[PDB]
Design a protein around this ligand. Structure first.
Ligand SMILES: *[C@@H](C(=O)O)[C@H](O)C(=O)N[C@@H](CC(C)C)C(=O)NCCCCNC(N)=[NH2+]
Length: 213
């Protein structure tokens, strides 16, 4: 694998989103992962509907939180519509999937990275973007502006985000707090933490969509 990778520089990452006040991070990280594998295997970069997951993925709780694993299973079972045909409202409404216009992206399955294993996560990011988790509630994380973030942060994971790259000392992560946070919406989290769960719990729980060429 390469010493560094950046899926943005392979055209597999869409612009940064802003989830707003809604506790919908689980829809953003999962969609970013799906957009990534879809570009990798089809050649097209599409912007996909977080709102569809928010409304339609029954085992999650809309703006009250959710489960990236189940979001990815939904995409493998039902597919997902384009954002432009099922736009983000930042509030849960009735599922309108069957009424949405336009094409669908359908994946074939879901994989899981062996947890608390930095090399396993890096190896997976070398292949595709990954939906991961971090503890984002800390003031240092909330106030992050740039550079390599090492903390202070605990490992009580609370926020789903998408890993879209790495380099020797960092994992590169697409957050859903708009471009006004961090590095145009991105954060670099240090590799090589003393925590088995990694810095900010970044190694705690990582899943990804699978889709065949
Ligand atoms: C994250 C956010 O919007 O910042 C959002 O709160 C969320 O989905 N968090 C997940 C975090 C995990 C580490 C993936 C979460 O807390 N999921 C469990 C949600 C359970 C909510 N239950 C009810 N009844 N609302």
């Amino acid at each position: 694998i390469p010493t560094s990778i950046d899926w943005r520089q392979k055209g597999a990452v869409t612009p940064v989103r802003n989830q707003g006040g809604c506790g919908s991070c689980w829809t953003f990280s999962s969609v970013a992962a799906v957009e990534g594998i879809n570009k990798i295997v089809t050649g097209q970069l599409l912007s996909l509907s977080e709102q569809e997951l928010l409304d339609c993925e029954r085992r999650s709780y809309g703006c009250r939180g959710g489960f990236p694993l189940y979001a990815l299973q939904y995409v493998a079972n039902s597919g997902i519509h384009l954002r432009q045909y099922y736009p983000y409202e930042g509030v849960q409404r009735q599922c309108r999937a069957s009424q949405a216009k336009g094409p669908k992206v359908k994946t074939d399955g879901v994989g899981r990275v062996p947890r608390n294993n930095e090399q396993a996560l890096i190896q997976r990011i070398a292949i595709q973007p990954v939906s991961i988790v971090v503890e984002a509630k800390g003031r240092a994380f909330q106030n992050y502006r740039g550079g390599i973030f090492a903390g202070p942060c605990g490992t009580s994971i609370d926020h789903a985000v998408a890993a879209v790259g790495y380099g020797n000392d960092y994992i590169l992560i697409k957050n859903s707090w708009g471009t006004g946070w961090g590095e145009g919406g991105y954060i670099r989290i240090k590799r090589g933490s003393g925590n088995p769960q990694g810095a900010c719990g970044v190694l705690s729980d990582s899943v990804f969509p699978t889709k065949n060429r």
